[PDB]
Amino acid sequence: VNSFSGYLKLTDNVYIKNADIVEEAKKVKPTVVVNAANVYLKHGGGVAGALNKATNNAMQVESDDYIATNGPLKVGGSCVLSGHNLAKHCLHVVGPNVNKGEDIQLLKSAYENFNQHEVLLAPLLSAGIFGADPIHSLRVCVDTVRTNVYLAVFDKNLYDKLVSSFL
Ligand SMILES: OC[C@@H]1C[C@H](F)CN1c1ncnc2[nH]ccc12
Ligand SMILES: [Cl-]
């Protein structure tokens, strides 16, 4: 039993809700919140910009030190950093950004990072400003993640389409 509330159950392990991931994280304070990161951890907009803003830019400061030490992530890769005031940890995961021409096949590799964590709050990888089809992202999530994932979808119209079209 966990403290996630109001989610629709899609499969044994995948749950979905129309919610702002920032407000969800502040309420639940999950062990792991997933960020929709880029390889430079530049949290400018989309999910990343919103999460970073909610940390008063502390996420960005921590991220800049991480990059200065380690260099950029790989597309499909991840790193674990602090969750600041939002969660114990933030798993920064880089899905392919279609608006940069990145290979959508890497979306499965990106979701594989979730399997290293028993329970996660997450957005749909490569959705929004990363330019992939969210219906496809949900499909890959369901077919790749085996740990317990609680998906927050910001747009109510999109949430309804994901549920009604879910196979
Ligand atoms: O599944 C994540 C959905 C799809 C798209 F990627 C953006 N999005 C969000 N969901 C909840 N809160 C959010 N805050 C900022 C963005 C955002
Ligand atoms: Cl977005």
The domain spans of the chain are 8-163
**Closest Cα to atom 16, ligand 1: which residue?**
47
Let me know the angle formed at the C-alpha of 80 by 55 and 104, rounded to the nearest 5 degrees. Answer: 100
124 Cβ below 6 A of ligand 1:
yes
E strands, 23-160, in order: 32-36, 78-82, 89-93, 119-122, 148-153
Distance CA 16, CA 160 (A): 10
What is residue 12's DSSP assignment?
S
Resolution in A: 1.0
Method used to determine the 3D structure: X-ray
Alpha carbon 154 to its chain centroid, in Å, reads: 12
150 Cβ below 6 A of ligand 1:
no
- For ligand 2, an ion, list residues with CB under 5 A: 46, 128-129
Distance CA 44, CA 148 (A): 28
CB atoms closer than 10 angstroms to residue 5 = 11
The strand pair at 8-9 and 14-18 is best described as: antiparallel
The contacts of residue 9 (CB under 8 Å, 6+ apart) are 15
CATH superfamily of 8-163: Leucine Aminopeptidase, subunit E, domain 1 (3.40.220.10)
C-alpha dihedral, 119 to 26 to 54 to 43, nearest 10°:
10
CB 76 within 8 A of CB 96: yes
Let me know the angle formed at the C-alpha of 116 by 133 and 43, rounded to the nearest 5 degrees. Answer: 55
